[PDB]
Enzyme design. Structure first.
Site, PDB file in Angstrom:
ATOM      1  N   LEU E  37      14.210   0.691  30.066  1.00  8.09           N
ATOM      2  CA  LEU E  37      12.887   1.176  30.431  1.00  8.09           C
ATOM      3  C   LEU E  37      12.983   2.113  31.627  1.00  8.09           C
ATOM      4  O   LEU E  37      13.662   1.807  32.613  1.00  8.09           O
ATOM      5  CB  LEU E  37      11.954   0.008  30.755  1.00  8.09           C
ATOM      6  N   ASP E  38      12.306   3.255  31.532  1.00  4.44           N
ATOM      7  CA  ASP E  38      12.216   4.189  32.641  1.00  4.44           C
ATOM      8  C   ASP E  38      11.242   3.651  33.692  1.00  4.44           C
ATOM      9  O   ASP E  38      10.610   2.606  33.520  1.00  4.44           O
ATOM     10  CB  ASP E  38      11.782   5.563  32.133  1.00  4.44           C
ATOM     11  N   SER E  39      11.124   4.383  34.803  1.00  6.26           N
ATOM     12  CA  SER E  39      10.245   3.946  35.884  1.00  6.26           C
ATOM     13  C   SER E  39       8.807   3.796  35.402  1.00  6.26           C
ATOM     14  O   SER E  39       8.114   2.849  35.787  1.00  6.26           O
ATOM     15  CB  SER E  39      10.321   4.931  37.049  1.00  6.26           C
ATOM     16  N   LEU E  40       8.334   4.730  34.574  1.00  9.33           N
ATOM     17  CA  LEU E  40       6.994   4.603  34.013  1.00  9.33           C
ATOM     18  C   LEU E  40       6.937   3.580  32.885  1.00  9.33           C
ATOM     19  O   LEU E  40       5.895   2.948  32.682  1.00  9.33           O
ATOM     20  CB  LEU E  40       6.494   5.956  33.506  1.00  9.33           C
ATOM     21  N   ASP E  41       8.029   3.409  32.137  1.00 12.48           N
ATOM     22  CA  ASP E  41       7.996   2.507  30.990  1.00 12.48           C
ATOM     23  C   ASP E  41       7.666   1.082  31.415  1.00 12.48           C
ATOM     24  O   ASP E  41       6.863   0.403  30.764  1.00 12.48           O
ATOM     25  CB  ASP E  41       9.333   2.551  30.254  1.00 12.48           C
TER      26      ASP E  41
END
Lengths: 125, 95, 115, 217, 79, 69
Positions: E37-41
């Site tokens: 997961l990315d920072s926004l995910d």
RNA sequence: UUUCUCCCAGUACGAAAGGACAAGAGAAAUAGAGCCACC
RNA sequence: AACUGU
């Protein structure tokens, strides 16, 4: 009388896929409320546009004159100018391309505003 | 009408259907919509509108004339039409 | 006062208007019973060798009292279907177009800046 | 004692009674709407009822560039550049749709008419709409801005260089050679400044008006 | 409150989100590495949990949780 | 990437709450568009550019959904 | 003085499709006669 | 081509 709440409820009845309403402060010399509407097809756009005006005429507004419908010629964008509110009814694909919601949410900060360019008028010789 | 000399004018002309906005009783000044032929300080003839629509307007007006001598009811010094905004009234807000 | 010739400025993001072009613009037709074109009056403008309908939003002719006199002639392009050619307008646009007789809601729905 | 220009009647054959009636309406309206004292070159913010909009008022800010008219029909024009567009709005003092008048910056400019500012650089004409009112000294004359504006290329709306206009707020030296001034000076009409037939005195009329205005208060 | 109810309900709200592939959606399922997961995910991942259980979770400690059981404990002690 | 990723969770969550509190507009479109706004923009941004985006959203959050009614 | 729109009214009429009158209102345009409060 | 009351 014909007011914002009555029309939006009527918009729900005719099943507008997209409705957006933006209020405007008194300082700006324009309508109190700007409304953006959507409809699946041009036939749906015509039906909903006529319904609101027909309801408007029936719903008092005797002091106000009859409201002509603008944009019926266009199959993708119809706009009706009422006394205190302006509703712009279009297609979903047409809606996103124009991004009317961005215009009013971001009065002068909308991205497409920068895309405008200028021209020239020099003497040929 | 105003005469312009050899070039003209100086001919009797009539303007019809001019509404009255206000009348000043003290100075007997009538405020009439539109322009009137002639120069400023020029005498004019005023008569009730002869248009078919206003065939009988004297029924609701002083039928022979207004007699200040009778003094049935003293009129206000300045008479205003309902739509006219009198000075000293609050600033008009378009609501 | 838009009339014969009358070098104009295309305030729109339309491809024809946006792209710079050498030829000065010579407006052809004014869509009014009278020959003079003012704010809110449809006109025909020749841009990039093409003819497109345009809506006047500003003029340099002296105007009525209580109104701003623009220093440049500004126009907005409108398609045949009635939708604006461009999706955005940059110059401040008078809000009197709403009350003006005609179809002006679409253009106003495209004008970001109102004075 | 600052007597507003509109009260001063112009020479003519018009009935004096008209001015008296017009002044009464003007004085009575002034009670409803306060007309602050201002001069050309002052930046003003005026609140006016919006007819096109429904139940909405707006304020427009601009430098006062010209004053015209007399009596109840007198109007004042203030200029500004908004979004890079120069705009001049002529406001009628006694129009009922003017809700309020605010002098954001009370000051004077070199010339009594600032139409040449259109030919001047935009910065001289650019004013922030949201600029707050600056302090003023009641027991003083309005500040006079003596900055000389720079013009754009020679083709102008009007030939300001001519002696007839006699603009003192233009940097003619930068944009005009002395020879060009001499060509402009060919229209000097020096006899005009020396003609007493073009002189009209309103000092007595101005003085008389002051008591009448104050008496109405 | 039932800890098991939160554990499977937290897993349920994690399962509801479509973008993440629940190849290993265990009670100890990690976010940055296990779910990639990315920072926004991770943001919307917490948001789905927040909607179900009355939100009021601040990110100051939410991004530190890194697994459904840890948020389960954080939910358990705050209710 | 963000100056503070914490604001995003608070920022995004309020938007969803406002959508449920947004009556006159169509709730369905608001949800999809807002989620697109985060997905379209927040994936890749710079600290200075991201500050403008989050700052406008924060004002968007703190001003009755930035005037959406 | 002439034109257009609106209204009447999606009514009358008509199986539907379609679609009026007259009366009223608002916009303009031109012609004629004028006017300078403003520009 | 521009320019200007042509």
């Amino acid at each position: 009388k014909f007011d914002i709440d009555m029309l939006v409820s009527l918009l729900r009845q005719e099943n507008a896929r997209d409705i957006c309403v933006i209020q405007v402060p008194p300082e700006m010399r324009y309508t109190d409320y700007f409304v953006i509407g959507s409809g699946t097809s041009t036939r749906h756009l015509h039906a909903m546009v006529h319904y609101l005006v027909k309801m408007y005429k029936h719903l008092k507004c005797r002091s106000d004159p009859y409201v002509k419908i603008e944009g019926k010629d266009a199959d993708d964008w119809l706009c009706v100018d009422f006394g205190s509110m302006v509703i712009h009814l279009m297609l979903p694909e047409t809606r996103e391309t124009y991004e009317l919601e961005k215009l009013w949410t971001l009065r002068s900060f909308d991205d497409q505003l920068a895309q405008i360019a200028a021209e020239t008028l020099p003497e040929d010789f | 009408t105003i005469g312009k000399g050899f070039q003209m004018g100086n001919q009797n002309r009539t303007v019809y259907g001019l509404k009255v906005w206000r009348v000043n009783t003290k100075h007997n000044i009538i405020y009439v919509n539109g322009s009137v032929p002639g120069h400023k300080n020029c005498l004019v003839k005023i008569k009730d509108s002869t248009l078919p629509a206003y065939k009988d307007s004297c029924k609701n007006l002083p039928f022979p004339t207004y007699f200040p001598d009778g003094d049935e009811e003293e009129l206000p010094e300045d008479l205003f039409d309902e739509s006219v905004w009198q000075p000293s009234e609050p600033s008009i807000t378009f609501a | 006062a838009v009339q014969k010739m009358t070098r104009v400025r295309v305030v729109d993001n339309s491809a024809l208007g946006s792209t710079p072009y050498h030829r000065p613009p010579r407006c052809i037709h004014v869509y009014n019973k009278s020959g003079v074109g003012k704010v809110g009056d449809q006109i025909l403008l020749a841009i990039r060798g093409q003819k497109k309908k345009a809506l006047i939003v500003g003029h340099r002719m002296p105007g009525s009292r209580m109104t701003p006199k623009f220093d440049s002639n500004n126009v907005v392009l409108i398609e045949d279907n009635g939708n604006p050619v461009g999706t955005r307008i940059k110059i401040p646009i008078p809000t009197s177009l709403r009350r003006r007789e005609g179809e002006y809601s679409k253009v106003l729905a495209i004008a970001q800046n109102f004075v | 004692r600052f007597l507003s220009p509109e009260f001063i009647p112009p020479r003519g054959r018009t009935n004096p009674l008209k001015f008296k009636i017009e002044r009464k309406d003007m004085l009575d309206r002034r009670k409803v709407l306060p007309i602050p004292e201002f001069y050309v070159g002052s930046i003003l913010r005026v609140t006016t009822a919006d007819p096109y909009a429904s139940g909405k008022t707006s304020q427009f800010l601009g430098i006062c560039i010209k004053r015209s008219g007399n009596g109840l029909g007198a109007t004042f024009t203030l200029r500004n550049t908004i979004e890079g567009q120069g705009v001049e709005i002529c406001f009628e003092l006694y129009n009922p749709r003017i809700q309020e008048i605010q002098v954001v910056k009370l000051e004077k400019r070199l010339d009594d008419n600032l139409l040449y500012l259109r030919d001047a650089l935009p910065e001289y004409s650019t004013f922030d709409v949201n600029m707050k009112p600056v302090p003023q000294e009641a027991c003083q004359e309005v500040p006079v801005n003596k900055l000389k504006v720079k013009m754009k290329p020679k083709p102008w709306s009007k030939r300001w260089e001519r002696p007839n206009f006699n603009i003192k707020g233009i940097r003619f030296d930068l944009a005009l050679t002395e020879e060009q001034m001499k060509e402009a000076q060919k229209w000097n009409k020096p006899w005009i400044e020396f003609d007493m037939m073009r002189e009209y005195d309103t000092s007595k009329i101005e003085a008389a008006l002051w008591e009448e205005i104050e008496a109405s208060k | 409150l039932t800890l098991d109810g939160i554990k499977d309900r937290v897993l349920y709200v994690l399962k509801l989100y479509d973008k993440i592939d629940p190849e290993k959606l265990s009670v100890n399922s990690h976010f940055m590495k296990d779910l990639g997961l990315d920072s926004l995910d991770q943001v919307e991942i917490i948001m789905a949990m927040e909607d179900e259980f009355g939100f009021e979770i601040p990110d100051i400690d939410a991004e530190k949780l890194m697994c459904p059981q840890e948020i389960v404990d954080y939910i358990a002690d705050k209710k | 990437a963000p100056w503070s990723r914490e604001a995003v969770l608070c920022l995004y969550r309020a938007l969803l709450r406002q959508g449920r509190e947004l009556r006159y507009t169509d709730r369905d479109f608001y949800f999809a568009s807002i989620r697109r706004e985060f997905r379209k923009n927040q994936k890749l941004e710079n600290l200075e550019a991201r500050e403008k985006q989050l700052e406008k959203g924060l004002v968007f959050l703190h001003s009755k959904l930035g005037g959406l009614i």
